[PDB]
Amino acid sequence: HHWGYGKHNGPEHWHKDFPIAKGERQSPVDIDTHTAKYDPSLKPLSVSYDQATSLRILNNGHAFNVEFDDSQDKAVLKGGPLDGTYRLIQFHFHWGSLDGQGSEHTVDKKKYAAELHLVHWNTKYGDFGKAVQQPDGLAVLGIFLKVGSAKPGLQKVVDVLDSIKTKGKSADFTNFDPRGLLPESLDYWTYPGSLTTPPLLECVTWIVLKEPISVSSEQVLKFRKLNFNGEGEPEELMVDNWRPAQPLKNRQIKASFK
Ligand SMILES: Cc1c(Cl)c([N+](=O)[O-])nn1CC(=O)Nc1ccc(S(N)(=O)=O)cc1
Numbered sequence: 001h002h003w004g005y006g007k008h009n010g011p012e013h014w015h016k017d018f019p020i021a022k023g024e025r026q027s028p029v030d031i032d033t034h035t036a037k038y039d040p041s042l043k044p045l046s047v048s049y050d051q052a053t054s055l056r057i058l059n060n061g062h063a064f065n066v067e068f069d070d071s072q073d074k075a076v077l078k079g080g081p082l083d084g085t086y087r088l089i090q091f092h093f094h095w096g097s098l099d100g101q102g103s104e105h106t107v108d109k110k111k112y113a114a115e116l117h118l119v120h121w122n123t124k125y126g127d128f129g130k131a132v133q134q135p136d137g138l139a140v141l142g143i144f145l146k147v148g149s150a151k152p153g154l155q156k157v158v159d160v161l162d163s164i165k166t167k168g169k170s171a172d173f174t175n176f177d178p179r180g181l182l183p184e185s186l187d188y189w190t191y192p193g194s195l196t197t198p199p200l201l202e203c204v205t206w207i208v209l210k211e212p213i214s215v216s217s218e219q220v221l222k223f224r225k226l227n228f229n230g231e232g233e234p235e236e237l238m239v240d241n242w243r244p245a246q247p248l249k250n251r252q253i254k255a256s257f258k
Pocket residue numbers: 117119128129130132140194195196197198199200
């Protein structure tokens with residue numbers, strides 16, 4: 001009886017195994033755009049993905065991850081609110097059963113159809129496992145998805161999902177360029193938070209882009225064909241794998257833009 005997204009193991013239950021669920025810097029949050037303060041000291045975000053080396057795509061039973069070789073100084077996030085250099089390790093999405101929900105962060109209570117998380121670890125801690133034990137260990141770049149025109153740079157991901165329908169399936173997924181998932185603008189909000197799935201560790205500087213990307217209805221429909229269950233188990237579609245907004249408590253959300 002491990003954690004998931006259902007009535008009996010979903011977000012409202014996670015605090016029993018992971019008491020930090022009720023902590024002081026949990027994610028996601030609602031971004032109140034009128035209360036977020038423009039901070040002219042914030043730097044432009046530096047996203048340098050020219051040398052990113054995707055390796056593999058994995059259905060891990062809660063989402064799918066596109067994994068990167070993070071053994072060298074490649075694919076890194078700097079600037080913005082960050083001190084020093086953060087290296088890309090994986091990306092994944094959260095999405096809904098319907099186009100009207102799926103994002104983890106919300107904007108003035110608006111839910112997007114999905115949310116992309118590009119996960120990076122602070123190179124001062126040497127690798128990901130040590131970084132998650134630190135309050136400035138990770139930087140997650142969050143990007144909203146709305147349904148409209150297709151995102152051509154997403155299609156390679158969509159097309160491999162049939163090969164990882166079920167929990168534990170992976171496929172080689174080399175040469176995927178995450179630059180194709182980025183909107184035009186790097187305007188962002190930022191706040192201190194947590195992992196949005198167990199273990200819910202309070203180690204993340206969240207950077208949420210204002211501009212969503214558009215994906216087609218057909219692209220997101222293919223996300224919704226994935227399964228939470230393993231092969232030869234009763235089918236439970238992988239949908240609504242999002243945690244709701246958590247209390248802001250004593251935090252300030254800062255905007256990079258006026
Ligand atoms: C904790 C841990 C360790 Cl340590 C390892 N490892 O292999 O070294 N893997 N993981 C798993 C993990 O929880 N990651 C995670 C990343 C991003 C998010 S999100 N939705 O972007 O906030 C939530 C969870």
